Amino acid sequence: AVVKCKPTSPGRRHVVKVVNPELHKGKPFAPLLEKNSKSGGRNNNGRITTRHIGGGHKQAYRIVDFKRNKDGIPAVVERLEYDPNRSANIALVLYKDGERRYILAPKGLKAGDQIQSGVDAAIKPGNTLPMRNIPVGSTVHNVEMKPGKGGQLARSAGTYVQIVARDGAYVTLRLRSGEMRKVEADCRATLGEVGNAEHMLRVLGKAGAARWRGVRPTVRGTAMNPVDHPHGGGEGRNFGKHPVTPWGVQTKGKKTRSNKRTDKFIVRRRS
Amino acid sequence: SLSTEATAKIVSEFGRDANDTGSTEVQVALLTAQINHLQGHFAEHKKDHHSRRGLLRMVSQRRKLLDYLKRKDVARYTQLIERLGLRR
Amino acid sequence: RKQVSDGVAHIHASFNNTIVTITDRQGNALGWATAGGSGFRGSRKSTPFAAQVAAERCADAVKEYGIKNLEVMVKGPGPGRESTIRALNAAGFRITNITDVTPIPHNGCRPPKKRRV
Amino acid sequence: EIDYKDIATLKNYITESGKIVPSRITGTRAKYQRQLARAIKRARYLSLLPYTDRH
Amino acid sequence: IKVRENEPFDVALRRFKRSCEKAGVLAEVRRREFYEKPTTERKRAKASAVK
Amino acid sequence: MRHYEIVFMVHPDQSEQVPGMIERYTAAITGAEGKIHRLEDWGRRQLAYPINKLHKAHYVLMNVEAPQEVIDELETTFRFNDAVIRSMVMRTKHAVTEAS
RNA sequence: GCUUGAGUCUCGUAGAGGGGGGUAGAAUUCCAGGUGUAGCGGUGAAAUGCGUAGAGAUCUGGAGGAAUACCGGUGGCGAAGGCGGCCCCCUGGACGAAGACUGACGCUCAGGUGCGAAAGCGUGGGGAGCAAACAGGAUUAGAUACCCUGGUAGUCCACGCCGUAAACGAUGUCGACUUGGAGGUUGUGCCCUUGAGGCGUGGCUUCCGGAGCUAACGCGUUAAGUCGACCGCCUGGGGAGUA
RNA sequence: GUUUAUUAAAAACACAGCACUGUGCAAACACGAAAGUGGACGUAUACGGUGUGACGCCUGCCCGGUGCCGGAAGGUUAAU
């Protein structure tokens, strides 16, 4: 659960840790590891393109099954592991033919649970099926946008998607943003919601925790100069014009969505 | 509620004479079994204050019965607590 | 120029005002009238005589359609429904049945506290 | 004494709008009135009796 | 609630239009039945009435 | 084992599958070593108010003595299978008059 | 030592007693659509407001939240706060015919501990109605209000606080005795198995009333009557349940 | 903690927190004349932009002006 630290020092005064004793203490599964090198704030042109990304802890990428397959083969769940690359925890699962894979761990999943992925799979948290064998109203996660592509929606910790309706070839989904959108019914979805729902309850306590995450300091345009930001300047604190991005586009309000080939799929815009 | 077969088993176990359902050891053992079952109940169901009042009534009744048995016969009290596993 | 001759009167009566609406059997409304369009304001439109004038004007609006038989569905606590059936029967439709479809809920939503005075 | 599966007795103990008639009108006892209300609600849930006559 | 006109009829009216419970309960579900004061006052009045 | 009473309604469209699910449910109870006290099929029956905008529905009653685990599995089966519009499983008022 | 106080077991009975989950039906609101036109809404009157970009009214489909019309009761349960759709799971208490068992194991309890309406506070959700604050329009001599039109916190859920109420029956708990009538609710014995008919025995309750008590109002077998055990509280009003 | 490495180390900047707003993934946004790339082998408990700056108590009134969001009935209105 959440652990409020004793204020033995400033920086430990205001930190809440979320700790899971169920998580595996030790090395991850080495056949499903890849090299992950830091490249944020670095284009192939070498320029910073996303600001406030820099050095954090070294991390290794875990190959997680998102396009879940091996239909009809049950898999027993071994110990849940920690994943630095995402807010969610992951589960190392072992199929009956001797194949280990990494799964986005749902909320109720424990070590020893059985999961399955086919069209004959019983509907149960941790099982994935296309959304024409899944009843309307169930909360799902790790749901594809195209049939066979892999889960793109509800991958963060604690997130879920509600199956609201069925067209007959499309399935309407209420997303975590409140948006309703039409997704094809042959797209697969894992049942239940994603675990680690206490991830939003952590408070980092100090600037060093953000630096271990990998977030470089954010400078305000009011603190900058007129050459640097559209905000900036003045012989006091007040600038006094409409708030904008560093490149001039207005940032309070001003919806910026220019897609026209997916407007047929978004049904109700998020509120 | 404790089942009829369970109460019959505890009465037969803790009664050295047949049909001794009113003796202090039998009453304390019945209360202890119901207390363990209700601890298993309340772990899943916190905030059941109305049933916890009956639990505390059973705890107080068991404690008063054990106090009476300790005043009456200390050997019976020690034998009962060493076969029940309480009051450390 | 309608040949089916079956119509439904919907009388939404309330303590301020009444509304009469003649529709077909499928729910598509054909005509409507009200005490305010009849020419009464406040207490004069809360009177049941304004409901009689409203139902007469609504029947005048449906005289082009020429409905022979007319169901009646009243709704609300208004005093004007009891004159509205009488005005429609004086207009000349044959009333096959009279129905009361006022919304009597369950506890449901919380009622207001307003107008305590 | 009172079972919800038959319908003729239960329509005799409701009114035309589907409401349960009061015990002061029916003359039945309080225990049987409570059992009657429970059976009426169960039959309403299984749609053997309507909640209201409008729909 | 529901009436249907008998096929011999001289006028269309309702024979229970003043004793109907619909307008009696609608004015109460509009606002605030207390369920502890008015039932007590009504039962006290009934107990004083019947003797 | 605990006594129970299960009444469920099936689609008129899927009214030909009713003996198959009767065999399935009785097989589940007898495999979980319970017994069926009663079983009645009232067939297609007019319903008082329309649910799911649907016509008259197929009515099945059974009185069943079975463990609460297989009764819970039966109720979750009734939840997940969409051929049953409505199900009610009730413990109380057991030992009713036969064929009422 | 005893059972007669207290408790336990067998078999049943009623109940919105509590905790968790699922589901159902009216209704309100919102969205999309069909018909249709010039008003709707509100009030003692109006006006702000909605509607000429189509409101209100009627019908269809969908979404979401909250509370469960009738039953419903001078009913029921819980120590109190309190608890109302239906179904399941776990569970507390009460009562009854009959029999058995232990044998004073009992009563009260300053400190202590737990529970504790509504409003409020923290974190995370939810938000349909209602609605403090706020805004507009009325009323008025004025109106920071009563009234109307909106409307945020809140009301709802999870986990933590807070620990107060006209938390009242303004009546602390336990035990015993003391004339009566009329009902309600819930068990049981007998009679003529022929009926929701008659005669008893228990519990919980509502009203009237005799002696008695009280300053009086009134209480009156569930006492404010006659006693016993223990605890809490008061010593003129204001200051003040304040520093 | 950082800062004008060479006259200013500060109350300045940053900061954990807080809020607003954009973003349904071929995401927003950024670099790029385009391919492509970062964001991210992430997926609304995520990412960006803005302002404020632990914590405690709080954050009142004003939408007339300028922005932004929503609507298209009417007026004006380009190439054609």
Curated annotation (Swiss-Prot), chain C:
Organism: Escherichia coli (strain K12)
Keyword entries, A-Z: Methylation, Ribonucleoprotein, Ribosomal protein, RNA-binding, rRNA-binding
GO cellular component, one term: cytoplasm
HAMAP family reported for this sequence: Ribosomal_uS11 (MF_01310)
Superkingdom of origin: Bacteria
BP term (GO), one: cytoplasmic translation
SUPFAM superfamilies xref list: Translational machinery components
Family: Belongs to the universal ribosomal protein uS11 family.
GO MF annotation list: small ribosomal subunit rRNA binding; structural constituent of ribosome
Subunit structure comment from the entry: Part of the 30S ribosomal subunit. Interacts with proteins uS7 and bS18. Cross-links to IF-3. In stalled ribosomes contacts ribosome rescue factor SmrB.
Name of the molecule in the record: Small ribosomal subunit protein uS11
Role according to the record: Located on the platform of the 30S subunit, it bridges several disparate RNA helices of the 16S rRNA. Forms part of the Shine-Dalgarno cleft in the 70S ribosome.
UniProt xrefs under Pfam families: Ribosomal_S11
Gene that this sequence comes from: rpsK
UniProtKB/Swiss-Prot annotation, chain F:
Alphabetized UniProt keyword annotations: Acetylation, Ribonucleoprotein, Ribosomal protein, RNA-binding, rRNA-binding
Single GO biological process annotation from the record: cytoplasmic translation
Residue numbers of N6-acetyllysine PTMs: 93
PTM notes: 5 different forms of the protein, varying only in the number of C-terminal glutamate residues, were isolated. The sequence shown is form bS6-6, which is the longest. The first two Glu are encoded by the rpsF gene, the other Glu are added post-translationally by the RimK enzyme.
A GO molecular function held by the record: structural constituent of ribosome
Record-annotated membrane-spanning stretches: none
Family: Belongs to the bacterial ribosomal protein bS6 family.
Protein name: Small ribosomal subunit protein bS6
Top-level taxonomy: Bacteria, Pseudomonadati, Pseudomonadota, Gammaproteobacteria, Enterobacterales
